[PDB]
Amino acid sequence: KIPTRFSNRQNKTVNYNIDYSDDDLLESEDDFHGIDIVINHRLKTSLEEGKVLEKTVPDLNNCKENYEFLIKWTDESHLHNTWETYESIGQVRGLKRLDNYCKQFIIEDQQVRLDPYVTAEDIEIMDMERERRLDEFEEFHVPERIIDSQRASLEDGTSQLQYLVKWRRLNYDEATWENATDIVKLAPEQVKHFQNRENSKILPQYSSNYTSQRPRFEKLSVQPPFIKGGELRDFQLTGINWMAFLWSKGDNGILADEMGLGKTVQTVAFISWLIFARRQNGPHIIVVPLSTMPAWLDTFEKWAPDLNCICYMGNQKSRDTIREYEFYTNPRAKGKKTMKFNVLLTTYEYILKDRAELGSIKWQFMAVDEAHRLKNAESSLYESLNSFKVANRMLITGTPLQNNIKELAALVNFLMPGRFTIDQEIDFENQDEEQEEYIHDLHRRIQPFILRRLKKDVEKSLPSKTERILRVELSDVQTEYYKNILTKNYSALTAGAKGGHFSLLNIMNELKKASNHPYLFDNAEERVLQKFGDGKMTRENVLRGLIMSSGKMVLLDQLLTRLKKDGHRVLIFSQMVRMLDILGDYLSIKGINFQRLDGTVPSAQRRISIDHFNSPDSNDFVFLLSTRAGGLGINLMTADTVVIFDSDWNPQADLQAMARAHRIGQKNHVMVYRLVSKDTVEEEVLERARKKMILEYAIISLGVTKKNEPNAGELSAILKFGAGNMFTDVLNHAEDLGGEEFLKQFEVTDYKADIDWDDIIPEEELKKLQDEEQKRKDEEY
Amino acid sequence: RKESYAIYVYKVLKQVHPDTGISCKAMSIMNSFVNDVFERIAGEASRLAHYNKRSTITSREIQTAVRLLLPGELAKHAVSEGTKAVTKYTSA
Amino acid sequence: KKPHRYRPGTVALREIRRYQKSTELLIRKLPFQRLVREIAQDFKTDLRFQSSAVMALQEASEAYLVALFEDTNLCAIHAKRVTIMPKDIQLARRIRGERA
Amino acid sequence: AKRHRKVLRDNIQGITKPAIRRLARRGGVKRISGLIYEETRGVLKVFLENVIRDAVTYTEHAKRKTVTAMDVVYALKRQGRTLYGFGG
Asked: Is residue A163 classed as helix, strand or coil in its secondary structure?
């Protein structure tokens, strides 16, 4: 209370309050319909004057009387867009946006139209994106969901019924109050869905109270009637039976089906069964990646149209709109608020951002899609999701085990925290019977809790995928760079164009860079150009330096020529985007129509590139990827060959890379070439990947969905394989019990090139390169 | 086992403000301040002992270092504090 | 295109009164880490950095720049001006002894 | 020419114009001329290399490759700029 010590020093009192008020500055401080979005323009202002004066370029004042612009105004609903003119606007807020649209679109469009140096590819891609935008803007007219209805009084308008409308690709901050009449006349299906949601027969407050007394589940041999949708398949119905039988015992599960089998359809049908049959229609939460979430939204709209599935993304005001307009039946009260929605779709970012506003909900079910993101128990998402108050949880993934047993332990501790323990990592050096007994114990422990179906067991029309490991020797530049890094030679590495502070931290990263290409190091192309092509760099020796600098590039060039000779298209996957830049330059000087995708490319250009590669009239031949980008939703149907340029530590990343082209319904035999640098650090990369594949084939593949006696022999055989080193008509795109299948695609096919400097760029390619270089000087540019 | 000054600074804080806490960064700043003042006074007293050809550091050297380093009323109040502490320690 | 524009100087006074109350670092962390690493690779190669070392460098650099800007503002006020110029920084560093 | 160098040289430009403006606002500066920012970047670079050289010397005395916070504290202390909050 009272202090026992004071100061005898005679200080003056000091006001330490540093809070300031700007009330003395209000003299110069204080003492909604404007232009928001300009969508499209029309060349006729009022009427067609004539076809004359079609040449030259218009100025800013010339466009002020010749064009009319489509305007979406501030605080409007994209249906009151008006075709306006500069003199028809006057002076409103947002005129600078109109000026910017006019300048950018009109000036650059007439510049690309009137430039003689414009190819057909540029004009068709510019038209591509142009139409895409115009239509994305056209999709905003269609209503998607009606939130709430009110009675509003206008200026002597008595009472009017006003709907709160959400749009198709817009969000809840764009939800607008609109008249009921044109909303009914526009899309009455959404209106009748709103009245179906108003006096709905399924609410969280009407849920049953099964407390360890859940009824027994009979097997459903037919599709249930409340799941309308399309038509469930037989393996999907078996999945429904497995999910319902595991829920009836009060247990949680991992749906480990391989991609393409429709896991989303299975879990939406299970949610429909939980709501309709067992009357557990309370608050369910589904946490998905953001890129896949439209594929969840339309699945919920199609297969379970009677459900109150809501969407939880966006900024703060949109999530506030969802929170105080759609969570509660009685949002204006302050006591116990019952829930109104049935299913809440959300993402990981808003689990972390809004754990306080979502953790205080008595959830009846959790479904986490792509649960390998939950593979780390020390992550923030694991601590956020594990603290939720949910009765039943479910993990949906394709790769339950990726690197070690600890990730599977984290998944089963997220499901059942305590009944499963793992305290021994599998080591491929003992090979004793105790490890085999431990493996069989983990087999029999997680057997009913994991359901996994492969793409070969169902849909018996999928062509096989063959993986060939090609080990190539190193070039002289690669060998001297490897020797300089491995036996650290700062003086020798700095020598050549004054260095540039060569960083030898992360030695294995530099060894992988040296195994890929010498040009990944700074000031390394100059030495190869000045030592072999005598530094002139005259458009032909640059390609020779690119090909002959790295030992992977000669095999890549031979594969590219052979696949161009045949009717094949190729994806090329790399772990580095700088090596992707190197290959992009190699195909640019080489002159091959290529497309590219990595983390730097935004999602719109990603969609453009994927649609351009998959078009039937595509001139593209090779499509480059960074391996870990794009998620699981990339469709690469048209390609046939996959070249893994750089191997990953995680083999599931390379498996997803191969499954980008090896999807369901593929019409060609997918061929995979893995490029390996001989006697390098990539050898132990492949050894660790082989050990992880051995581990995944041991635990996961032998516990899917008289052989018990031979299991004690074949586990010992696969452990002897796991304790052995894999490193002791070659480019054919063809191939002419399950245990011997796994012994394939681990063989090493050594490739020897022995190609000298003057063999590459033959007389057909050298004549084309020299004529293009000679004609470039005639046209200057 | 970090050998800090945190508990004594906390007891002094409870003497002067019995209902006021302290953050960890402020405690680190206070520990750095005590270490800085310790090494300033000890270095000045070491220099004073070396200047007078003395092999020992007594309370006179510490007193002279306090009157040299601390300014104004801080100096004389610290001299009174240390003097009555030495007087209390000697008699008992 | 809205009315009620503010007078030039009261907004700057508002930021003066705002940033003198707060105590956070006014420089973004990643450009400062890149600057520290770029400066440090001249003296020695293969240098690792603790995060607290970069934070101590940022605290000291921000305190040094704020004190230099106070001396620079005093220099500019002494020259019957309210705008700081590089000659004010040069005079402040010369009187401080950094340029002397 | 998609390929380029991994290293970056304009890391002094990472100390942006609004950062220098905020640092002047903390210093009580009302109006700033346009030539202030290059001078401020040069002054900051000189101060940073002066501190960093001494910290690196303290690091190589201990036979280390990692610049700890204590080396930065000692480097700032030797030139007469004592910094609290990191020495404990």
From this structure: strand
C6, C41, C45: residue with CB nearest A28:
C6
Q: Does the beta-carbon distance from A522 to D3 stay under 8 Å?
A: no
Q: At what angle do helices D36-61 and C51-78 cross, to 10 degrees?
A: 140
Strand duo A82-84 + A68-73: pairing:
antiparallel
Query: Are residues B18 and A9, on separate chains, in Cβ contact within 8 Å?
Result: no
Q: Do A581 and D5 touch (CB under 8 A)?
A: no
The b/e string for A287-314 (b: 16+ C-beta within 10 A; e otherwise) is bbbebbbeebeebbeebbebbbbbbbbb
Q: Which residues of D touch B4 (CB under 8 A)?
A: 88
Chain A residue numbers with beta carbons less than 8 Å from the beta carbon of B11 are none
Strands A68-73 and A35-42, how do they pair? antiparallel
Strand pairing report for A363-369 and A284-288: parallel
B20 three-class SS: coil
Distance CA A564, CA A549 (A): 23
Residues followed by a break in chain B (C to N exceeding 2.5 Å) are none
Q: Which domains does chain D have, with CATH numbers?
A: 1-88 (1.10.20.10)
A509: which 2 tokens? 């990263």
Query: What amino acid is encoded at C1 in this protein?
Result: K
Residue A332, chain C, CB below 8 Å: the answer is no
CB contact A500 to D (< 8 Å): yes
Residue among A661, A668, A663, A627 nearest A644 (CA): A627
User: Are D38 and D20 in contact, with CB atoms under 8 Å apart?
Assistant: no
Q: Do the annotations mark residue A756 as ligand-binding?
A: no
* Close Cβ partners of A745 (under 8 Å, ≥ 6 residues apart): A466, A467, A468, A469
Cα of C80 to nearest chain D Cα, Å: 13
Pairwise CA distance, residues D53 & C9, whole Å: 40
The DSSP code for A576 is -
